[PDB]
Design a protein around this ligand. Structure first.
Ligand SMILES: NCc1nccn1Cc1ccccc1
Lengths: 237, 300
C-alpha cells in the first residue's frame, strides 16, 4: 500500500527498493517574448532514483533535447520518467532489481505501472510522506553535472558519502532528509551552515563535508533550528 | 406471436418479461405469457415475494424452440424447460389460451424500446457468455460473477464476458506505452474490434447484454463490463463514424429505460463524467448527454 509514518522502518529492511522522484525532470525559466507574451525555455533536468538502504543514487540526466518538438511537456515528463526507470530496472541483473518502487508523487503511479507491465512482481507504491527530494538540485555537485550535460547521461552517486561505515541506514536516511528539508526551506542559510567552517572540506569523491561525529550533531542541530525558524518566519509563531 | 406457458405459480413472485412486470399471488391461476414478439431475444425473470434476494431469469428466443416455466419445490425456483413434443405444447397452449389464463406481452405499437435495447444481441452470443450448451436458453442471476471478477470461483456458473483491462499487455503495445494508454484506439480497433469481436455489431451486442443483466438482475460484474466497453470507445481518438452514431442511440435507450431509483448503484460517476465531458468523444454523444443531463444532473 502507501508508505507513511507507520511503516517507515520497511525502507531499511533487506528487500531492495527504490524511491523515484520526478520533480526536477522538466525544468523551465519562464520569460517574456519580444511581443510581450510569455515563453518557457527548458533547462536540463534529472530523475532522482534512490536506494534508501544503500544510498545508491541513479541520477538520470534529462537533456533539453528530449523535449524538442513535443507537446504537453509536463505530462510527457511523467511518461519519460517512467520509461527511464523501467530501462534502468531492465539494465540491472535480476538479483539487483527492486521488489518495490516508491514514487514520491501519485501522478507517477499509472505511467510507471504501464511501463513496468513486464515486471508484475515489482510493487509500485505511492507515499503519504512529503519528502524533500526536490531539493537534490541544491547539492552543488549534482546541480553541476546536470547543467553541464550535453547529451542524455546516467551519473552514479552514493548520496550518503561514507556515512554507512559509522551509522545505520535509518540514521543516514534521517540525516539526508534533514539536510534536504533544510536546503528546501532556506537554501542560503542551509548552505551557510554546511560551509561556514573553512577547515571542513568536501572530499573529491563525496557530496557533503567530512564532519566528525560531534560536528554532525552540531550541524544536525543547526539544521533543525533553521527548519523551525523558517516555520516561524512563514507562520509568524 | 409466440407463447411461454407456465405449469402453475405455487409461490408468490413478481414476474418480468423484458421491461414489463406483474405480480402473481401464491397459487393464483397464472399459466403464462402470450403474444411475445418474434424476432428479438427476450428475458423472463423472477423476484420471489419472500426473498427479494436473488433476482434471476432466462434469456431465450422463441424461434429456437418451445419453452415453458415450471416451479421446482426442491430447488425453490421457477425453471425454464424445453418441450420437445410439438403437439403436446400447442395443445397445452391452446387449452390455456381458451381459458384466458395468460397475460399478453403488453407492447405499445408506437414503442421500439425493446428492439433498441437488444438490436445487436443474438442468442448465439449470449450462449457463449453463459455456458450451458444442453439448453437453448440461458440462466442469469444477481450473484453470478464474471471471468475477470474470478481472476482477482465456480467456473461453470460464470459470465464469460470479454476481459478488458486498460493497464494490461493486451492493451499496451511495447514502446507505445504513453500513446496507447492515453488514446486507446489501438486496443479498440485492432485488438478488440478486428481481433476479438470481428465487427462492431458483436461488440455492441455484448455491451447491450451486459447492460441488460446489470439492470434486470443487479449483476455487479455485468455493470462493470458495460461501463468498461463504453469507456474503451469514449477513450479512443479514432472510432469509426458509424459506431459513434450508433453508440449514442444505444446508450440513449439504456439511460432512458433505467429505473430512476437505481441510478445510484448502476451508474459509475467517473466513467460517465469522463465519457461525456473530458474524453475524445465528449462531443459525439449528443442524445445520450442530453438525456443524462435532464434526468441525472446530480451524478454530474
Ligand atoms: N560508481 C559510482 C559510485 N560511487 C559510489 C558508489 N558507486 C557505485 C554505485 C552504483 C550504483 C548507483 C550508485 C552508485
Amino acid at each position: 500500500g502507501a508508505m507513511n509514518s507507520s511503516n517507515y522502518a520497511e525502507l531499511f529492511n533487506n528487500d531492495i527498493k527504490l524511491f523515484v522522484d520526478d520533480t526536477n525532470v522538466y525544468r523551465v525559466t519562464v520569460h517574456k517574448t519580444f511581443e510581450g507574451n510569455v515563453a518557457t525555455k527548458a533547462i536540463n533536468g534529472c530523475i532522482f532514483t534512490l536506494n534508501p538502504k544503500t544510498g545508491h543514487l541513479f541520477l538520470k540526466i534529462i537533456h533539453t533535447s528530449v523535449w524538442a518538438g513535443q507537446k504537453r511537456l509536463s505530462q510527457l515528463a511523467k511518461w519519460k520518467t517512467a520509461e527511464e526507470v523501467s530501462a534502468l530496472v531492465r539494465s540491472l541483473p535480476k538479483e539487483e532489481q527492486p521488489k518495490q518502487i516508491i514514487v514520491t508523487r501519485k501522478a507517477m503511479l499509472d505511467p510507471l505501472e504501464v511501463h513496468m507491465l513486464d515486471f508484475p512482481n515489482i510493487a509500485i507504491r505511492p507515499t503519504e510522506l512529503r519528502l524533500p527530494f526536490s531539493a537534490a538540485m541544491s547539492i552543488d555537485k549534482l546541480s553541476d553535472v546536470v547543467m553541464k550535460a550535453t547529451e542524455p547521461q546516467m551519473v552514479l552517486f552514493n548520496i550518503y558519502d561514507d556515512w554507512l561505515d559509522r551509522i545505520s541506514s535509518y540514521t543516514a536516511f534521517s540525516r539526508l532528509t534533514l539536510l534536504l528539508r533544510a536546503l528546501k526551506t532556506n537554501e542560503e542559510s542551509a548552505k551557510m551552515i554546511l560551509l561556514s567552517d573553512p577547515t571542513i572540506t568536501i572530499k573529491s569523491y563525496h557530496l557533503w563535508p567530512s564532519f566528525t561525529d560531534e560536528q554532525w550533531i552540531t550541524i544536525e542541530s543547526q539544521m533543525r533550528d533553521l527548519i523551525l525558524t523558517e516555520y516561524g518566519r512563514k507562520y509568524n509563531v | 406471436m409466440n407463447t411461454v406457458p407456465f405449469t402453475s405459480a405455487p409461490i408468490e413472485v413478481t414476474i418480468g418479461i423484458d421491461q414489463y412486470s406483474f405480480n402473481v399471488k401464491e397459487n393464483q391461476p397464472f399459466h403464462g405469457i402470450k403474444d411475445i414478439p418474434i424476432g428479438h431475444v427476450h428475458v423472463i425473470h423472477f423476484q420471489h415475494a419472500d426473498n427479494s434476494s436473488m433476482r434471476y431469469g432466462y434469456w431465450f428466443d422463441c424461434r429456437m424452440g418451445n419453452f415453458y416455466i415450471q416451479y421446482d419445490p426442491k430447488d425453490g425456483l421457477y425453471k425454464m424447460m424445453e418441450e420437445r413434443d410439438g403437439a403436446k405444447f400447442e395443445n397445452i397452449v391452446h387449452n390455456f389460451k381458451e381459458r384466458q389464463m395468460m397475460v399478453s406481452y403488453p407492447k405499445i405499437d408506437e414503442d421500439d424500446t425493446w428492439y433498441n435495447l437488444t438490436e445487436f444481441v443474438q442468442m448465439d452470443k449470449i450462449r457463449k457468455i453463459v455456458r450451458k450448451d444442453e439448453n437453448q436458453f440461458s440462466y442469469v442471476d444477481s450473484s453470478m460473477t464474471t471471468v475477470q471478477e474470478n481472476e482477482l470461483s465456480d467456473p461453470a456458473h460464470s459470465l464469460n464476458y470479454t476481459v478488458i483491462n486498460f493497464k494490461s499487455r493486451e492493451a499496451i503495445r511495447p514502446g507505445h506505452e504513453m500513446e496507447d494508454f492515453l488514446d486507446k484506439s489501438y486496443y479498440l480497433n485492432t485488438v478488440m474490434l478486428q481481433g476479438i469481436f470481428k465487427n462492431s455489431s458483436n461488440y455492441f451486442g455484448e455491451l447491450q447484454f451486459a447492460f441488460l443483466n446489470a439492470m434486470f438482475f443487479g449483476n455487479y460484474g455485468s455493470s462493470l463490463q458495460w461501463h468498461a466497453m463504453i469507456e474503451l470507445i469514449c477513450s479512443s481518438a479514432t472510432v469509426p463514424k458509424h459506431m459513434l452514431d450508433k453508440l449514442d442511440e444505444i446508450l440513449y435507450y439504456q439511460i432512458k429505460t433505467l429505473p430512476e431509483q437505481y441510478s445510484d448503484i448502476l451508474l459509475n460517476e467517473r466513467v460517465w463524467n469522463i465519457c461525456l465531458y473530458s474524453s475524445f468523444q465528449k462531443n459525439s454523444l449528443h442524445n445520450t448527454e442530453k438525456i443524462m443531463e435532464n434526468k441525472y444532473p446530480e451524478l454530474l
